[PDB]
Amino acid sequence: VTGELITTVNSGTPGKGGEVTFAVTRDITNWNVTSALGNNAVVRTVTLPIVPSAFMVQPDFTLKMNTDLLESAELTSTDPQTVVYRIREDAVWSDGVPITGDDFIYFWKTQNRRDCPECLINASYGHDFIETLEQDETGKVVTATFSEPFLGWQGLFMFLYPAHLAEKHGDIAESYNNFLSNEVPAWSGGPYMVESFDPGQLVTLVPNPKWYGEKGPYLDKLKFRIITDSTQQLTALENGEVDVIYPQGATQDMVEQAAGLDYLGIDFQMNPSANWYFMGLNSKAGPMSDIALRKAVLTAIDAGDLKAKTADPYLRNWPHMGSVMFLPNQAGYADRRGARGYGTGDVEKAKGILSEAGYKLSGGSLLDPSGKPVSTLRLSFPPGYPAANDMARLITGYIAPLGLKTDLLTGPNATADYLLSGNFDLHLNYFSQQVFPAVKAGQIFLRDTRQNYFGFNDPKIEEIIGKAAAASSIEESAAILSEADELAMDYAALFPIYQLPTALIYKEAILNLRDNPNQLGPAYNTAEWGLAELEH
């Protein structure tokens, strides 16, 4: 029985001074997390201490307005939708220049698809729904007017950049694509700022002397040490080379090892991630273009056994995920997978689905309706996730009674970015869920979107997602979006499995360090990090 909540784990009041080193798994070649090439958890973690945010995702998956930056943010009208931001007078960049509407306007122009068509952004995420963005004479009152309703407005302006510096480095595209992406940032609007960068080795941050927030910073230096081999991170922690690690794809052996290091002052936190494992099925081409084969495969997969073999031995009460649009804790969630018989391990039902579509078993091999053997299925998955490797082998075994064979494929060319209609049949990977399911869904399920790898092609799904993204609450959005989840599961091109576990493993002298099991991650509150005081 504990008094800590997910939002208050490891709380305390640290002393002043000292250093903390946090291991990260990628080198930094792009410093702009909002760009296409900078959008990953490492860049996000390393730049969260320097980039101010209007709202921040918290460990309970809520959005909290940043009261260091903002006095208020208010939806002041809905005819048309209007949001007013009042920036604190004392919010300033590290050179003393106030943070103002100039910074909101610059970011909006880079993200809105219109004013900077050459900006190489990750995604607009609704900034394009803002049609006018104006500021008062003081620069501290910013009014956004929308061309149509948009639920996810608190997700906007989550990363602000110094417009007065960008303007010294070319036009907007040049400054966004070059200055803000390629240069080590000399500026900050947060508690820390970069002192030095040793490529491939170490980012060193120091306090921003003009930090304007309520708390911190407490450390003399905050360092991010680059360790690309994530399996060497626990050794580095034990040796004192780093004080915090946050590896992806934690295993039972990793948990047991970390637990054995308690005598060295090491502790750990683990939670269900916003990242969720899935198996995608190639509905565009190859054997999986036949929905009957997709449904038969999904019905034969035994999801209980999959989780029993790969999660249950070291993770208690770990939830199945039976939706492709909602995590188990989000409004709208239901087991739409199991409602359709997917994941039930039901070989006889799967064989019936195949027989009713004209397939036949001959000599232990499945024949397509024309009479030709179904090809060996190409099941690919990216490296670095032992659970995915184990699940690929288990899935091979579940479908072998259907007369199907698999070829297991991996390596650096087996990433989602490199998928082609012609180079896979099944693919195991993960998606990262967002606070607004309808916003994430618009990136995955629409024709011609960046993450529609498995061939969803349904104007009704797209219409539903658009209505859900226009709703006035997350709850109403979920009620609307549930219909799209049903239709997406009917199509059987995406099979949800379960959430990845996070693993934050660290020296317990560090206070206010806690898991934030979402894309924003543990560096959401570095102003509060510090070392516990020893006794005088």
Author numbering: 31 to 566
What does the paper say about this structure?
The EDTA transporter system is composed of a periplasmic binding protein, EppA, and a type I ABC-type importer consisting of a heterodimer of its transmembrane domain components, EppB and EppC, and a dimer of its nucleotide binding domain component, EppD. EppA binds free EDTA, but not metal–EDTA complexes, restricting the ability of Chelativorans sp. BNC1 to use only weak metal–EDTA complexes that can dissociate to free EDTA, making it imperative to determine the biophysical mechanism of EppA’s binding specificity before any improvements to its binding capabilities can be engineered. Based on its three-domain, bilobate structure, the β2β1β3βnβ4 configuration of the core β-sheet of Domain III, and the two-β-strand hinge, EppA is a Class II Cluster C periplasmic binding protein. In summary, EppA’s affinity for EDTA, EDDA, and EGTA, and its putative affinity for other APC chelators via molecular docking, suggests that it is a general binding protein for aminopolycarboxylates.
